[PDB]
Amino acid sequence: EQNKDIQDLLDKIVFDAQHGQIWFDENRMLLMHTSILGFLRKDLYQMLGLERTKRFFIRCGYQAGMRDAEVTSKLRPNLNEAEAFMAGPQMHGIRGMVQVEVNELHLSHDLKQFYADFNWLNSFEAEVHLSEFGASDQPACWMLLGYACGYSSFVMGQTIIYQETHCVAQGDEHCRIIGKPLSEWENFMSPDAVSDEIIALQ
Amino acid sequence: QNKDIQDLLDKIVFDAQHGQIWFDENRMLLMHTSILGFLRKDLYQMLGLERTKRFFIRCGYQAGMRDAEVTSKLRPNLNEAEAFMAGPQMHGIRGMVQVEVNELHLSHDLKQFYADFNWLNSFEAEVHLSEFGASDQPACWMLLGYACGYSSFVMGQTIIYQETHCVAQGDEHCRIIGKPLSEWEFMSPDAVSDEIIALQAEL
Ligand SMILES: Cc1ccccc1O
Ligand SMILES: Cc1ccccc1O
Ligand SMILES: [Zn+2]
Ligand SMILES: [Zn+2]
Numbered sequence: 001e002q003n004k005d006i007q008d009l010l011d012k013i014v015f016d017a018q019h020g021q022i023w024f025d026e027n028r029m030l031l032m033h034t035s036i037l038g039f040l041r042k043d044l045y046q047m048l049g050l051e052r053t054k055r056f057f058i059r060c061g062y063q064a065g066m067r068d069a070e071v072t073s074k075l076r077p078n079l080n081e082a083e084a085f086m087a088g089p090q091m092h093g094i095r096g097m098v099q100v101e102v103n104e105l106h107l108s109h110d111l112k113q114f115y116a117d118f119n120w121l122n123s124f125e126a127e128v129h130l131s132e133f134g135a136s137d138q139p140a141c142w143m144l145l146g147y148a149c150g151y152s153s154f155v156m157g158q159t160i161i162y163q164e165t166h167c168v169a170q171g172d173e174h175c176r177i178i179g180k181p182l183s184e185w186e187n188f189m190s191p192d193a194v195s196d197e198i199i200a201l202q
Numbered sequence: 203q204n205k206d207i208q209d210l211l212d213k214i215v216f217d218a219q220h221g222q223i224w225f226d227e228n229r230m231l232l233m234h235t236s237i238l239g240f241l242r243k244d245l246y247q248m249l250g251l252e253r254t255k256r257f258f259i260r261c262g263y264q265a266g267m268r269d270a271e272v273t274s275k276l277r278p279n280l281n282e283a284e285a286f287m288a289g290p291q292m293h294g295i296r297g298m299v300q301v302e303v304n305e306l307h308l309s310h311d312l313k314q315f316y317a318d319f320n321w322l323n324s325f326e327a328e329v330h331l332s333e334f335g336a337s338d339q340p341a342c343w344m345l346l347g348y349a350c351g352y353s354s355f356v357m358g359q360t361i362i363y364q365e366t367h368c369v370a371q372g373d374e375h376c377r378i379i380g381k382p383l384s385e386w387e388f389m390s391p392d393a394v395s396d397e398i399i400a401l402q403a404e405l
Contacts, residue, residue: 006218015297017207020323022297028235030325031296033228033268036261036344040241043257047249056244064237095232096216096223122221124229 006090008075013094027071037143038128045133051199054142059195061146066191068147069154081107088151089118098123098144098175107156112181114156120144120175126168138201139167141175149198152179159194161185163201206284207291209276214295226272239329246333252399259347259395266351267391274356282308289352290319299324299345299376308357315353315361317380321345324376327369339402340368342376350394353380360388362397364405 014023022029044053065088072087082105089100099121107114120141129140139145145162152160162179166172182197204211215224223230245254266289273288286308290301300322307316321342330341342365353361363380367373386401 003219010218015295017204017291017295017297018300020294020298020300020321020325022232024232024234028325028328029297030233030235030238031223032231032233033265034231035264035268037231039257039261039264047253056248059244060237060241063240064234067234067236093221094218096230097221099219099221124221124231127229 006094009072009087009090009094025071027067034124034128037125038132041128042132055195055199057142058146058149058198059192061143061148062150062191062195063146064143065147065150065152066154069151073155081109085152085155088148088155092144092147096124097147098125098141103176109156112156112158114152114160114179114181116148116152116162116177116179118177118179120164120177123168123175126175129169135171136167136169138170139164139175140169141167144175145177145198146195148177148179149194153194156181158182161194161197206287207295210273210288210291210295213272213276225269226275228268228272235325235329236332238325239333242329243333255343255399256395258343259350259398260392262344262347262349263351263354263391263394264347265344266348266353267355269348270352270355282310286353286356289349289356292352293345293348297325298348299326299342304377310357313357313359313382315357315380315382317353317361317363317378319378319380321376321378324369327376330370334370336372337368337370339371340365340376341370342368345376346378346398347395349378349380350398351391354394357382359383360394360397362386362394362401364398364401 012025068091076084092098092100101119101121103117103119105116123141123144125141125143141164145164148162159182160179161182162177164175164177166176168175213226269292277285293299293301302320302322304318324342326342326345346363346365349363360383361380362383363378365378367377369376
């Protein structure tokens with residue numbers, strides 16, 4: 001049944017197996033093993049160190065995020081800014097990456113305001129980090145953080161930074177994140193400048 | 203229908219509300235092909251052709267291996283061909299590539315294998331062109347490693363494919379040939395990748 005909330009997203013997704021294809025509207029898509037991100041993670045971790053590995057993965061989340069936001073942005077006009085926005089959290093779910101449970105979410109584009117506080121349930125990345133590195137001294141959902149930052153930044157037309165305050169990878173129960181405009185914490189290829197600041201986590 | 207794809211489809215669970223997708227006990231991610239292209243380029247720019255290539259093949263190898271573990275559990279009332287086909291059928295469900303069989307000759311016990319396949323709508327050739335323009339060599343690294351991996355597992359031995367024509371070199375479609383390592387003019391997954399690259403430059 002429904003499950004009616006995300007139905008305009010699913011509608012957009014076509015599975016043509018006899019032809020080797022999958023579509024999210026115009027965009028072509030793949031169904032993948034999380035192994036290939038696990039591998040990328042092990043590899044890069046040792047070729048470059050952690051810092052550069054971390055950045056890379058925020059970058060890749062970021063571009064995914066931006067992309068989903070592009071593809072969904074005309075999509076919900078008879079709904080308010082927030083029911084719209086949630087497009088992002090929802091795709092993250094559809095794509096089998098993480099479950100988004102809204103603790104708080106308020107946003108106004110014109111007022112240039114944003115506050116998101118979300119629980120992140122069964123993060124695919126947290127699993128993957130643990131089964132290659134074990135318990136981390138810090139939160140490890142880098143790709144999911146990037147996507148968050150990427151997706152939101154587009155929808156809000158301004159830079160929006162998130163901090164994972166709890167992570168299953170540190171032995172918290174579930175991961176958790178808070179997101180505000182850049183301006184409200186402490187102190188293009190603008191896309192790559194943003195990646196850098198998500199790296200200054202606390 | 204998908205009369206012969208069905209058994210595979212019945213191992214794949216879409217749990218949208220929970221952020222989960224499953225194949226058997228394995229998690230899966232829906233991803234833009236254009237993000238793969240970006241990944242490919244960025245890796246290129248950090249480590250070079252050899253390593254990028256090396257990575258994508260090692261990756262494909264692993265996924266191919268895991269799938270073959272998963273599909274080996276099923277199908278055992280059928281014969282080694284109809285069973286083997288689970289692999290190319292997976293590549294299709296995964297939205298990766300479309301497989302068309304020219305010739306297939308296999309016997310686990312005989313240690314004989316020979317595959318000649320066409321690859322019809324290869325995502326990898328697409329994204330390669332986007333990033334790199336026309337190529338001097340074939341481009342389907344991940345698809346190839348997966349071919350090698352799936353096959354190697356399913357037979358008892360390193361089967362090695364060679365991409366013979368690639369859409370990215372301007373060919374009409376991509377095509378492959380698989381033979382056992384020995385028939386080429388061991389088990390280490392990172393050695394398999396070396397053997398594939400070493401070969402493609404001795405031809
Ligand atoms: C927190 C978040 C924000 C936007 C899109 C996805 C997501 O997980
Ligand atoms: C998935 C697969 C397996 C073996 C050979 C080709 C191919 O596409
Ligand atoms: Zn986490
Ligand atoms: Zn190709």
